């Protein structure tokens, strides 16, 4: 895929909306760049639900056009939260091709190949600096057809370089939708 990022609010715009809970900005894209007062990460939409990590969003609401959106799901055990995706949010379709060519999308819009090693693991084709993957948790992993395989959760690191990635597999996002 090709990928590009667009900024849509600044530092202060972000704190304020955080307090009000009310966001009237127009929402486009499958991948949202998200922020709390103290940290930033990613959210990805699949099946009309906007998904991200628990260690990121915790139990927080999502600022939205009719005020604070409550979480539809909060699964601490799997590091998974999801809100009803805000209008304009594009959804990815779940991957069904059991492919092992995966591509992580990061907050910088790099798409980096990852070799699948298990249902929720892949190794980075080239290791990366931890600093470069920080803040991309909640980003998607894509198969060569550009479907969602899962969302970025953790990296496995030897001394500061990430060597592999953990992600929430999409079957378990569907499961939690019962």
């Amino acid at each position: 895929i090709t990928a590009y990022s667009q900024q849509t609010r600044g530092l202060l715009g972000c704190i304020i909306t955080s307090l009000t809970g009310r966001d009237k900005n127009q929402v486009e894209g499958e991948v949202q760049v998200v922020s709390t007062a103290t940290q930033s990460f990613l959210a990805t939409c699949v099946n009309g639900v906007c998904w991200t990590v628990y260690h990121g969003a915790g139990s927080k609401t999502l600022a939205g056009p009719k005020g604070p959106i409550t979480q539809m799901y909060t699964n601490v055990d799997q590091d998974l939260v999801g809100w009803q995706a805000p209008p304009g949010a594009r959804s990815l379709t779940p991957c069904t091709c059991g492919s092992s060519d995966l591509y992580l999308v990061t907050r910088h819009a790099d798409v980096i190949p990852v070799r699948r090693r298990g249902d929720s693991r892949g190794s980075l084709l080239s290791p990366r600096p931890v600093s470069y993957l920080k803040g991309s948790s909640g980003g998607p992993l894509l198969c060569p057809s550009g479907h969602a395989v899962g969302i970025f959760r953790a990296a496995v690191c030897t001394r500061g370089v990430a060597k592999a990635v953990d992600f929430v597999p999409v079957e378990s996002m569907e499961t939690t939708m019962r």
């Binding site: 998200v34 990121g56 999308v105």
Partner: peptide, 12 residues
């Protein structure tokens, strides 16, 4: 108790 806020997007 505060909210998560959308501050940008990655377009694919």
């Amino acid at each position: 108790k505060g909210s998560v806020v959308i501050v940008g997007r990655i377009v694919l």
